[PDB]
């Protein structure tokens, strides 16, 4: 994810959507979910993925 490595001509979304479509998923990164409460396939297909979360040092236990 180095800055300034992907231009307007070579886009990042194009690159990673091709990567995804090469794995059987869809270009735009949306997979369609079901509702865990009603059990029905939601009408909109959701955008899901893997992101890196940090946990901050500020906790309600200290404030």
């Amino acid at each position: 994810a180095t800055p300034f490595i992907f231009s307007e001509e070579n886009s990042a979304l194009e690159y990673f959507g091709e990567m995804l479509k090469a794995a059987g998923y869809n270009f735009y990164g949306t997979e369609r979910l079901y509702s865990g409460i009603s059990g029905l396939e939601l009408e909109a297909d959701i955008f899901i993925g893997v992101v890196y979360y940090q946990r901050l040092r500020h906790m309600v236990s200290d404030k």
């Binding site: 300034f4 992907f6 070579n10 690159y15 091709e18 990567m19 090469a22 794995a23 059987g24």
Partner: protein
């Protein structure tokens, strides 16, 4: 028998030592530009549906 002022100099020479410029080649980088990130060949799906 003493030293007297003589005629004013007619000119001055100033010497300095200087080397010269080479041709402009402008060789910017060993491996140049920002080489683009790219597709691993073939890849293949690493996941299948159930059923």
């Amino acid at each position: 028998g003493g030293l007297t002022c003589a005629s004013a100099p007619q000119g001055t020479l100033r010497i300095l030592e200087g080397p010269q410029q080479s041709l402009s080649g402008s060789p910017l980088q060993p491996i140049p530009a920002s080489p683009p990130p790219q597709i691993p060949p073939g890849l293949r799906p690493r996941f299948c549906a159930f059923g």
